């Protein structure tokens with residue numbers, strides 16, 4: 001019944017993950033043949049969370065970035081909310097780290113500059129992510145990273161001491177990025193314990209193992225990101241051009257969106273109007289409402305073809 005609405009536009013394939021208050025399924029958008037990821041949430045189960053879902057959705061509508069997984073379509077039915085997202089066939093950074101054991105400093109840098117890019121942009125737009133971890137970072141077709149899961153934007157192992165103590169959202173995301181940096185280069189958490197309060201204690205103390213394979217510059221950067229006092233912690237600003245970050249690149253992290261929505265793409269508009277046998281101007285006007293309905297999804301998925309060098313064409 002709920003699925004009747006979705007199945008007008010998508011063929012549903014297998015579940016690819018489950019995360020707290022949602023399951024995500026692989027799917028194909030019937031009109032463009034593009035694969036997508038559909039986040040499915042039941043409104044009734046966890047009904048008081050629905051406000052944080054609703055603001056996650058509006059946040060995503062204001063994020064458009066080369067390292068942020070794109071929202072295409074929101075469908076609300078009687079009992080469900082369905083969010084159609086850019087599909088990242090490379091899967092989770094988490095599983096990539098498992099298979100490699102740990103990344104070299106060179107490859108960590110490549111990956112980490114993408115993460116800093118996404119997060120600095122999120123902050124530039126006035127948000128904090130607040131659940132940065134390797135399950136929330138995916139590899140797309142080109143092995144580029146895409147940040148997902150804005151359900152807590154405004155677990156324990158990645159949470160900053162000040163956030164734990166209920167006391168600074170920018171600074172807290174930097175701490176989390178430090179935990180991520182550590183995990184990339186080391187392949188295990190800097191603070192970990194079976195007992196949650198003992199984990200808390202270790203976080204508050206700020207002491208962690210420094211493995212033998214870490215370079216002095218890496219060790220310094222970790223020290224600066226993992227300051228328990230947020231006032232002493234490196235700020236986002238200084239992370240973007242940190243010497244460790246700058247090694248082999250020689251320019252600071254490029255955080256600004258490279259793909260911003262300026263004017264409508266003539267060719268996507270033209271293809272829709274021709275395909276729907278509709279007046280080109282009505283089509284422009286209707287696309288310009290930006291409802292995140294099936295027309296928006298189709299438009300955006302055509303834009304995505306264009307940016308992957310595929311012909312802008314409907315079937």
Ligand SMILES: COC(=O)[C@@]1(O)C[C@H]2O[C@]1(C)n1c3ccccc3c3c4c(c5c6ccccc6n2c5c31)C(=O)NC4
Pocket residue numbers: 016017018019022024037039069085086087088089090091092135136138148149150
């Ligand atoms: C259990 O794993 C997770 O927590 C994930 O964040 C990771 C996992 O499912 C979750 C719930 N997930 C999410 C949780 C919340 C929002 C989006 C996702 C999500 C997305 C994708 C994938 C994905 C692709 C391939 C393998 C696993 C994948 N997952 C997702 C997405 C995707 O390609 N696009 C969005």
Ligand SMILES: [Cl-]
Pocket residue numbers: 113114117252253254255
């Ligand atoms: Cl960069």
Ligand code: NA
Pocket residue numbers: 188209
């Ligand atoms: Na260890």
Ligand code: NA
Pocket residue numbers: 253254255256
């Ligand atoms: Na930039």
